[PDB]
Design a binder for this molecule. Structure first.
Ligand code: HEA
Ligand SMILES: CCCCCCCCCCCCCCCCCCCC(=O)O[C@H](COC(=O)CCCCCCCCCCCCCC)COP(=O)(O)OCCN
Ligand SMILES: NCCc1c[nH]c2ccc(O)cc12
Ligand code: CUA
Ligand SMILES: [Cu+2]
Ligand SMILES: [Zn+2]
Lengths: 236, 48, 268, 124, 117, 363, 56, 100, 535, 58
């Protein structure tokens, strides 16, 4: 969704993948917070008790059980964390029946969109180009450096498969709320998938550096109902 | 002539010009070089 | 440490080198070479006689290093059992650094070999690119390199048993038998019909083969120096650290060639 | 008595040749059986060896923490002033206005955005 | 540059370590071409004397002030490392015995003295 | 699973040499028991099934290694060595069998088996001891044990939780009848014998003439360890394209050449290169002969591949069983260079026998 | 008696390790039961009115 | 690994052979550097060791170390009620009674 | 003529360390000012200082990275603290290869000229610290600028290789009478391990960068997709060098801290052998994980699992080290001198910086944190607050022993507090900006990200004022440094114990566990004439 | 004299009272040419790296 002024946490999710990412992040932060509190408490104790101390214990230097325990505990923490990450990795993907295919070519400083289906006998594939609206031409209330003249439109509750490639340099297709971040290499085809659960507007930006106009190539997706999708498609 | 002022590449005491001048010019030049490059490449592309 | 007059000699077996001007001069030569090469390829110079002068200055600096490194060991006599061991360890650690650069090129060859791009037809050496037959001159070079590796061991055994004529002949034959390798591989770049810029095969074939050429010119220079320093009575029968340093290099070069002949010529 | 009485306030100013004299006079006086030593001698013997002088002074005195605190405050005020001066003279684009960040709210409310925690583009 | 030494008893400096020359037509030996601190070692290793010792310090008895451990040195000071009487008990402590004072090793108590040569 | 069996074979090979090298006669006993137990395991693989022998080897390794660490008695150490041998054969034989089982295609088998057989060098390099005397020595293997378990978590999660007709045939006598089957096995033996003969004796000669300390003796064999992994990984691919028989013949040739070249060296620097050549040649022969045996048995027999790998394991372990001490015993009369000379000449003479496998006989 | 003290640093070690872990769970069990679960409940309850409205 | 009754014998024999002030202070420095507080006999030997070398500040600072080593106050009062003959016989006065 | 033969034609190993220090100060000042230039443009939305030129912003970022990874931390941590302290600690007269040390120094001033001239001859080199091929080609960057920045990474590589060889060879055969290779201090072990990493990692970078150079200026088609090439290959060949480097910058720091924690808490380090084993493991596992830098390039689903498994495992050795530091600090007596303050600040800041790495080692979550200021906030805590703090502590620890001149305690404390406050106010809000979705390497941002970027341009002005105060502290150390040893008892290396009288302390004042603090006030030019002995 | 001047040079190179790279009476040949040409090379790379910052080409 849109970024908010004093942000502290993730943007509101609209895909199951982003929900999984949020859950996994909050599952790891548990153990990280526990470790940090432990180390901080020990340092506080050292400052409080042993500052300019008269007695120095210069013969507690080996240990044998405590070194077993600060070698085994982090291992069990790592295994506990690693289980859910592997499940999320192997499970979530386009398991069955992709239902729509969109090709998003990234040219130098704008995007090109092709809808692989919807072809007539003569090759009338619906296609367009998305630019960035300059500041001098913005209308009343349009976001700066995020608003495009032509926006991607998709139905809600349908699998969308984005096939990403590039024509000049290495770009990056990103939309934070939908949980999509894939590269656009100059000689290969990458693919990502998404399912949108509610209607709205979702904004994103490129990631990999490409030169002068890296800060202006926004991505914009609308999730309209099926009827509005049919009306929109019967006009383009 | 081993001593506490003998291993440094520069002279610090019994010096005509006081050491503060060489010490300050070092940091002034070091912290002013990166602005020269920006000025040069700004005056070359029209913008001021 | 109770020998009678012991304070008249050094108490530790290590070499305190005298002040030398070669590091700074080599640094300046490399600086000039880098700036001139970076400029000439994009205009700004025009004439090409400055790059060659820079290269010559770098080489002269290295040679003048080696003059002192030979004088400090054969005339002044500062090379004990400790300093010799240190020199050997350092040379091994340098040779390892050269070896791990060929690994990068081999990995570059195997990354494009397995997974060829769609732009080229899915086939190694592609259409319009005739490879070099491995039943030709590529097979003479293997034989000559193995014979060279076998002929330098007779030179190291002819110095242990105190033979003079019998170490010069072997070293001369080895030099004259590595020059033949270089000549054969310099008349093989003129009988090929695929260049540096025709494909990814021709950009990596030459990168690996090209580095081998320079490392063999270094061997020719080293063997010539070993002959010249033996003819003038510099090598004793138990203190000779040029021959060993030049023999460990030749064997590594031969082992590398036997990988450049199994992965570049037969496989395709 | 005058030599040893009240070493806690005079002892550090004496030179290094009048110190060894007192140390040498407290060495031929301690060999005798104790309880024959005056109280000032006992106090001086304790002070000369284990006392808060020389290499047992503290790393920080009470007047040094104040110096450090008021130095840090002075170093922060300078940065605040310089950033304020660089902050007043800004290029403020046309989007950074309260009457503009209200229309974006209407657009973002027509298309339900951030149904969870919240949407608001107002920061004046 | 002067007379050539025959054993390590007539070497008074770097001037007695040049040696004769090999003959034309033979591979020279180490005993006919060796000049500096190399021929010194070569002469030492042919009669049993080790010119460059490698014997770590004695770790048999402790040391008092009346009978201290004597450490030989051609300087006014020497660096000494102490680890204990059974030779690995005390952790490492470093001391600098000199010709006007003795080191004492704050932990175990051994005293070291410097012997000038 | 494909990845799971890759990991399983890798760890199975990795732990064995880890246990082997640590040290506080026995080697011969362990290799002998490994030789004896192998055909029984090969027979068991047909009826019981593959995973059971793999599972048994793990507990066998645990019991053997515990015996080593906690027991200083001679009898307990001998029992630990015997169980080490017996158990390994379970692990190695079952692992190789199922690795062939999942990887059906002829081409993929070579690359997968090269990746697998690279684990032997990793075992020797990773820890000279494993779980040795001092606690900090389990302050090094602890990080790697965690990684092994963590990767096994990947494998288990793939097979179990989420998405990832046996034939009685080829009797052992029928296996022995095929001479083609035999050829590879025979070569496999030769190479093993060579490193083996070399292992005990080479340090001893060095003591005699090199005047080298123990650290040189230990460091002499590192180039071979690197060479084995490099050669196996490269030629697991290259063997299919260049012809597996040609790779076998060439590798035997380099084995002989390096063995001859070894004695002449009078310095460690001369000693370094022949070790690398030996490693590359032995890795070449192993990677060439391992996949080809399954191909041969499939063409000329039914696809029940357990015993063939039993015969292969017999070939590998017979050399370590006998020959290391025998090589030294031959020395001091034959001398240092003559043993390597005879080994290399035998290798060169035996090399032309690889030609017969060039075209698989019709069947 | 009162003039025989043997081990006192070990008990301090145990008490310091037994207070730095309870405090950690206290500060991390507030992360997962006051900042995470209520957000999940709120999100789910938002999704289960948007289908009832569409049903009507 | 040592027991209480081996610690309290090793350090008594070691205090019975200190010959200078450096040595008495050295042995006193690492007696108060273990997990075991010295028994009254060990401190009794230490005071005599200080009396032979002729030092007074060490005999007063020994009793000041016990105030920091001991965990509580009843134990400190218990120590002073057993080393009372030694103090009144040699002549040591505590620091709390000097106010130096 | 004595001047040139002693500071230009040099053979003494302790006279190259001072040149290294004076060079690192310059190259750090340049980088910090370039950071200030970047941090003023990201202050409020729009185009503020750099008028509209988005080139000359990427140029500043690339120069800031290059000047301050390759010219400040490495020369200071291997040039100053290695060459000066390793021979003294192990008992060696000089380095085995002195002339190589001289060249390893003198290749740097030529390498700075190339980088400075790559920012003035044309539009510049705005390719990022990592020079990916198709943007750093001839179609986007057409001039002698990427070429000249490639040549600055060749000379530095030569210098690092030669220094690594010298260190490994000097610590193998050039030790004292009874120092086996298990009695070495921890600093020597750190230098040895970082040198091994340097040997095994630099040739790959040399090969990749030279291949890029050939592709640019000789049309060889290594990374061009129209002749059969893949740009992704470059990424592999970079990150095999990329990840070992971040450990080469941190391992020398660790050893330094150990010495400090063993001096001001009068207790030997808990499990020294465990420390050496842990450094070995951290070095070894740092070569087998290089592809977590590229999860979004389209890797397979089975290689992701390996790289998430092999990255988390490094937590165990570093955790062992942190816990052992706390254990060695536990029972002892603590005196808060200026090295110890930095030692305490390192223990908490590095932990916070490295706990974020475990959140980025996962492949599933890295779809949300890649190319974002989360990564920037991650690595500045471990680089700026972990390595720079170690360098400052090492300076404040060994400066009196080298120069013989003492410094003012109060000004040093003021600088410490200023830098702590500034670095914590500058690098923390980046975590929030990253979670909310701000990408990297952009001069202008949407209006949402304004507020936090106003706070992070406020900490830079505190850190730079700390730097100016550091300049004054050096000035007051050089002048009137002889009378500064009586202002505070900070000058004492170790204070008297409880039962040690002051009179006995003054005769036996220095008690150390290494040779470093037994040497004279400036260590003598020829320091070991008769060999030292251990037992 | 004969081919063994190895012994004579040795007495020369010890206490020659001049640096060992310029003690022989042939050192001149190696260094009068070398030092002089480096100066020309270094002065010809600083005339073009300042002539390139100003945009003047050849
Ligand atoms: C020099 C500092 C430094 C160090 C030491 C390291 C080491 C580590 N780095 Fe590295 N890293 C960088 C600086 C550094 N890194 C930089 C600059 C980059 C690239 C930035 C760029 O390309 O733009 C990078 C690359 C990089 C990335 C790539 C991020 C991306 O996708 O862009 C990641 C994570 O993916 C990562 C994480 C780690 C981790 C986990 C460690 C580990 O070594 C840290 C481990 C530390 C701890 C684990 C502390 C443990 C404390 C204990 C109390 C133990 C408790 C046990 C557990 C926590 C279970 N680093
Ligand atoms: C890569 C770029 C740099 C390549 C140059 C590397 C030079 C390595 C030389 C190693 C020297 C080792 C050494 O100590 O040799 C001394 C002299 O050797 C020598 O003098 C050997 C000189 C070798 C020079 C090679 C120069 C090739 C440059 C390329 C040209 C094209 C010993 O001498 P000694 O002890 O054995 O004598 C004793 C009898 N008393
Ligand atoms: N086939 C195993 C040959 C081999 C090569 N290198 C080895 C090292 C160790 C070992 O046990 C065996 C080997
Ligand atoms: Cu263009 Cu990003
Ligand atoms: Cu990384
Ligand atoms: Zn001691």
């Amino acid at each position: 969704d849109v970024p908010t002024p004093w942000g502290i946490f993730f943007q509101d999710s609209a895909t199951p993948n982003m929900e999984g990412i949020i859950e996994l992040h909050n599952n790891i932060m548990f153990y990280l917070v526990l470790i940090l509190t432990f180390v901080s408490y020990i340092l506080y104790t050292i400052i409080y008790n042993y500052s300019n101390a008269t007695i120095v214990h210069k013969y507690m230097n080996h240990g044998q059980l405590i070194e077993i325990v600060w070698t085994t505990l982090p291992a069990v923490i790592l295994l506990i964390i690693a289980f859910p990450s592997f499940i999320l990795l192997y499970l979530c993907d386009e398991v069955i029946s992709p239902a729509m295919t969109i090709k998003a070519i990234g040219l130098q400083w704008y995007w090109k969109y092709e809808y692989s289906d919807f072809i007539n006998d003569d090759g009338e594939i619906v296609e367009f180009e998305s630019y960035v609206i300059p500041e001098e031409l913005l209308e009343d209330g349009q976001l700066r450096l995020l608003d495009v003249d032509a926006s991607v439109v998709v139905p809600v509750d349908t699998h969308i498969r984005f096939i990403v490639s590039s024509a000049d340099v290495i770009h990056d297709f990103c939309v934070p709320a939908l949980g999509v971040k894939v590269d656009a290499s100059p000689g290969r085809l990458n693919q990502t998938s998404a399912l949108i659960q509610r209607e709205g507007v979702y904004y994103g930006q490129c990631s990999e550096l490409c030169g002068v106009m890296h800060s202006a190539m926004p991505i914009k997706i609308e999730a309209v109902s099926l009827y509005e999708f049919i009306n929109w498609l019967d006009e383009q | 002539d081993v001593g506490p002022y003998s291993n440094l590449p520069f002279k610090v005491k019994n010096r005509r010009v006081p050491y503060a001048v060489p010490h300050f010019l070092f940091f002034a030049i070091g912290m002013g070089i990166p602005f020269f490059a920006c000025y040069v490449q700004l005056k070359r592309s029209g913008s001021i | 440490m109770r020998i009678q007059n012991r304070e008249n000699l050094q108490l530790f077996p290590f070499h305190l080198v005298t002040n030398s001007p070669w590091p700074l001069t080599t640094s300046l030569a490399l600086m000039s070479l880098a700036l001139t090469l970076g400029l000439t390829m994009h205009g700004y110079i025009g004439n090409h006689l400055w790059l060659f002068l820079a290269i010559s200055l770098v080489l002269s600096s290295i040679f003048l290093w080696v003059r002192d490194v030979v004088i400090e060991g054969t005339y002044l006599g500062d090379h004990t059992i400790a300093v010799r061991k240190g020199l050997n360890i350092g040379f091994m650690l340098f040779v390892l650094s050269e070896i791990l650069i060929f690994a990068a090129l081999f990995w570059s060859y195997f990354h494009s070999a397995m997974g060829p791009t769609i732009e080229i037809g899915c086939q190694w050496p592609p259409v319009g690119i005739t490879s070099i037959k491995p039943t030709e001159l590529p097979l003479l070079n293997t034989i000559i390199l193995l014979a060279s590796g076998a002929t330098v061991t007779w030179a190291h055994h002819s110095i242990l048993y105190k033979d003079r004529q019998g170490t010069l002949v072997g070293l001369f034959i080895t030099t004259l038998l590595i020059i033949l390798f270089v000549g054969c591989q310099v008349l093989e770049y003129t009988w090929a019909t695929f260049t540096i810029a025709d494909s990814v095969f021709g950009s990596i074939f030459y990168a690996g083969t090209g580095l081998h050429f320079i490392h063999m010119v270094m061997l020719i220079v080293m063997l010539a120096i070993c002959y010249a320093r033996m003819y003038f009575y510099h090598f004793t029968s138990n203190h000779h650290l040029g021959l060993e340093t030049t023999i460990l290099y030749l064997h590594v070069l031969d082992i590398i060639w036997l990988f450049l002949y199994i992965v570049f010529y037969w496989w395709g | 008595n005058a030599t040893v009485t009240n070493l806690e306030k005079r002892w550090e100013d004496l030179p290094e040749t009048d110190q060894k004299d007192i140390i040498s006079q407290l060495s031929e006086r301690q060999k005798l059986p104790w309880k024959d030593l005056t109280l000032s001698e006992k106090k001086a013997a304790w002070y000369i060896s284990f006392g808060e002088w020389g290499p047992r002074r503290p790393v920080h005195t009470k007047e040094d923490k104040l110096y450090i605190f008021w130095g840090t405050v002075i170093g922060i005020v300078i940065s605040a002033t310089i950033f304020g001066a660089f902050r007043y003279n800004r290029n403020v684009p046309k989007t950074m206005n309260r009457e503009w960040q209200a229309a974006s709210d209407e657009y973002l409310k027509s298309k339900n955005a951030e149904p969870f925690t919240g949407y608001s583009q107002i920061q004046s | 540059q002067f007379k050539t030494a025959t054993s390590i008893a007539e070497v008074e400096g770097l001037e007695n370590l040049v040696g004769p020359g090999a003959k034309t037509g033979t591979v020279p030996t180490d005993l006919e071409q060796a000049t500096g601190l190399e021929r010194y070692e070569l002469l030492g290793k042919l009669e049993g004397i080790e010119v460059f010792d490698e014997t770590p310090l004695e770790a048999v008895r402790k040391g008092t002030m009346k009978d201290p451990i004597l450490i030989d040195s051609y300087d006014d000071y020497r660096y000494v490392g102490c680890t204990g009487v059974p030779a690995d008990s005390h952790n490492i402590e470093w001391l600098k015995p000199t010709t006007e004072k003795n080191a004492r090793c704050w932990e175990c108590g051994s005293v070291y003295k410097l012997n000038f040569l | 699973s494909r990845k799971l069996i890759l990991f399983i074979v890798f760890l199975a090979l990795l732990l064995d040499n880890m246990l082997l090298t640590v040290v506080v006669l026995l080697f011969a006993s362990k290799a002998t028991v490994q030789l004896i137990t192998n055909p029984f395991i090969g027979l068991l693989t047909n009826r019981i099934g593959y995973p059971i022998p793999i599972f048994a080897g793990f507990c066998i390794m645990f019991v053997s290694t515990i015996m080593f660490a906690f027991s200083s008695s001679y009898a307990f150490l001998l029992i630990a060595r015997s169980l080490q041998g017996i158990g390994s054969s379970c692990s190695s034989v079952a692992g190789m069998g199922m690795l062939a089982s999942v990887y059906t295609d002829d081409e993929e088998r070579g690359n997968v088996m090269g990746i697998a057989l690279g684990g032997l060098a990793m075992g020797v390099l990773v820890g000279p001891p494993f779980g040795s005397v001092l606690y900090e020595f389990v302050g090094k293997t602890a990080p790697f044990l965690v990684l092994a378990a963590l990767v096994l978590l990947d494998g288990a999660i793939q097979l179990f939780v989420l998405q990832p007709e046996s034939q009685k045939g080829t009797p052992l006598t029928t296996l022995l009848k095929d001479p083609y089957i035999l050829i590879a096995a025979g070569s496999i033996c030769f190479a093993n014998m060579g490193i083996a003969m070399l292992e005990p004796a080479l340090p001893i000669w060095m003591m005699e003439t090199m005047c080298s300390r123990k650290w040189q003796l230990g460091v002499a064999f590192l180039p071979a360890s690197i060479s084995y992994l490099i050669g196996t990984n490269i030629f697991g691919i290259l063997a299919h394209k260049m012809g597996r028989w040609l790779c076998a013949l060439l590798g035997m040739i380099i084995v002989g050449v390096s063995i001859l070249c070894i004695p002449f060296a009078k310095n460690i620097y001369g000693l370094i290169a022949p070790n690398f050549g030996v490693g590359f040649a032995i890795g070449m022969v192993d990677s060439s002969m391992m996949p080809i045996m399954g191909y041969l048995v499939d063409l000329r027999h039914v696809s029940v591949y357990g015993s063939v790998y039993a015969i292969a394991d017999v070939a590998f372990c017979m050399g370590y069983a006998i020959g290391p001490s025998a090589g030294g015993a031959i020395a001091k009369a034959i001398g240092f260079p003559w043993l390597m000379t005879i080994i290399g000449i035998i290798d060169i003479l035996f090399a032309p026998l690889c030609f017969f496998l060039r075209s698989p006989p019709a069947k | 008696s009162l003039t025989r003290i043997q081990g006192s640093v070990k008990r301090r070690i145990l008490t310091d390790i037994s207070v730095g872990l309870t405090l950690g769970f206290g500060f991390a069990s507030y992360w997962w039961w006051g900042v995470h679960k209520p957000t999940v409940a709120h999100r789910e309850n938002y999704y289960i009115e948007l289908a009832k409205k569409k049903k009507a | 690994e040592e027991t209480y009754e081996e610690f309290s014998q090793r350090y008594e024999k070691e205090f019975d052979e200190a010959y200078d002030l450096f040595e008495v202070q050295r042995v006193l420095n690492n007696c108060f550097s273990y997990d075991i507080v010295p028994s009254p006999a060990v401190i009794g030997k230490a005071l005599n060791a200080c009396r032979r070398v002729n030092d007074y500040a060490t005999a007063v600072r020994v009793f000041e170390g016990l105030k920091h080593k001991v965990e509580t106050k009843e134990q400190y009062d218990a120590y002073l009620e057993e080393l009372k003959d030694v103090r009144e016989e040699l002549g040591i006065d505590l620091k709390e009674e000097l106010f130096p | 003529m004595n001047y040139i033969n002693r500071w230009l034609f040099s053979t003494n190993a302790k006279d190259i360390a001072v040149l290294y220090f004076i060079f690192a100060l310059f190259c750090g000042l340049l980088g910090s000012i370039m950071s200030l230039i970047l941090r003023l443009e990201l202050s409020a939305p729009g185009n503020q200082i750099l008028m509209g030129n988005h080139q000359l912003f990427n140029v500043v970022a690339t120069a800031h990275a290059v000047l301050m990874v390759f010219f400040l931390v490495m020369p200071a941590a291997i040039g100053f603290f290695g060459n000066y302290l390793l021979p003294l600690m192990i008992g060696a007269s000089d380095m085995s290869f002195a002339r190589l040390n001289n060249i390893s120094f003198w290749l740097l001033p030529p390498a700075l000229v190339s980088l400075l001239a790559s920012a003035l001859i044309e539009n510049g080199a705005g390719t990022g610290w990592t020079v990916y091929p198709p943007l750093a080609g001839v179609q986007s960057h057409s001039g002698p600028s990427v070429d000249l920045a490639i040549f600055a990474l060749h000379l530095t590589s030569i210098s690092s290789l030669l220094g690594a060889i010298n260190f490994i060879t000097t610590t193998l055969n050039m030790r004292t009478i009874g120092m086996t290779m298990s009695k070495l201090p921890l600093f020597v072990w750190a230098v040895v391990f970082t040198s091994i990493l340097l040997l095994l990692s630099l040739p790959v970078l040399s090969a990749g960068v030279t291949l890029l150079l050939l592709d640019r200026n000789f049309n060889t088609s290594f990374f061009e997709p129209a002749g059969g090439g893949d740009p992704i290959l470059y990424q592999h060949l970079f990150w095999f060098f990329g990840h070992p480097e971040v450990y080469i910058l941190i391992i020398p720091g660790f050893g330094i801290i150990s010495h400090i924690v063993s001096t001001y808490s009068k207790k030997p380090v808990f499990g020294a052998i465990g420390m050496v084993y842990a450094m070995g493991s951290i070095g070894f596992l740092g070569l087998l994980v290089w592809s977590h830098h590229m999860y979004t390039v389209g890797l397979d689903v089975d290689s992701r699992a390996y790289f998430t498994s092999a990255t988390m495992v490094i937590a165990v050795p570093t955790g062992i080290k942190i816990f052992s530091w706390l254990a060695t600090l536990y029972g002892g007596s603590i005196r808060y001198t200026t090295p110890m303050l930095y030692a305490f600040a390192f223990l908490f800041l590095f932990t916070v910086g490295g706990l974020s790495g475990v959140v980025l080692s996962n492949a599933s979550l890295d779809i949300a944190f890649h190319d974002t200021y989360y990564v920037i906030g991650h690595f500045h805590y471990v680089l700026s607050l972990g390595a720079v703090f170690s360098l400052f502590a090492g300076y404040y620890y060994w400066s009196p022993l080298i120069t013989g001149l003492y410094y003012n305690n109060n000004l040093a404390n003021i600088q410490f507090w200023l830098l702590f406050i500034g670095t914590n106010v500058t690098f923390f809000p980046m975590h929030f900006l990253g979670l909310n979705g701000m990408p990297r390497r952009i001069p202008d941002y949407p209006d949402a990200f304004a507020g936090w970027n106003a706070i992070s341009s406020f900490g830079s002005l505190i850190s730079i004022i700390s730097v100016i105060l550091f300049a004054y502290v050096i000035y007051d150390q050089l002048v009137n440094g002889l009378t500064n040893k009586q202002l505070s008892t900070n000058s004492l290396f170790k204070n008297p114990d409880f039962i040690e009288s002051n009179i006995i302390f003054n005769d036996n004042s220095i008690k150390s566990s290494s040779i470093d603090f037994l040497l004279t006030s400036p260590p003598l030019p020829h320091t070991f004439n008769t060999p030292a002995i251990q037992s | 004299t004969a081919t063994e001047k190895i012994i004579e040079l040795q007495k020369f190179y010890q206490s020659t009272n001049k640096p060992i790279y310029a003690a022989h009476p042939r050192s001149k040949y190696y260094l009068i040419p070398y030092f002089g040409l480096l100066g020309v090379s270094v002065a010809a790379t600083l005339f073009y790296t300042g002539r390139a910052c100003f945009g003047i080409k050849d």
